[PDB]
Design a protein around this ligand. Sequence first.
Ligand code: NA
Ligand code: NA
Length: 127
Amino acid sequence: GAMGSMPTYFDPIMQEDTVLDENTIVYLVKIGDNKFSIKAISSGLEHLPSDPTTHAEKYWPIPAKSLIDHSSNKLLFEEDKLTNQPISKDQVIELFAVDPDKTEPKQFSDSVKRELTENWAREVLQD
Ligand code: NA
Ligand code: NA
């Protein structure tokens, strides 16, 4: 119509629909056997301990450009909004060229909680 649209995702960080661009953090998590979910967040890949909506600790990185280039695919987007429905391993291979069951995932870091714990312990023992 008169109004355009851009692909958006519901950002768990700010709890708001957010325009997807090349600065969006995008990754895959596994939520079941042959069931994977595409996630997008505005920040936090290096600081969060797990994925916000599933608390998955393991993920497969996906370039934002790959998701943007599929923005008209009805599997991933419904009315220009990122789907919350899972996709099969075959669909993952077809859309993103990654076999997750044959690729080592990355893991969210535990560094922030470790630093918090060390900060408390040092404060206890200082005067
Ligand atoms: Na954290
Ligand atoms: Na989290």
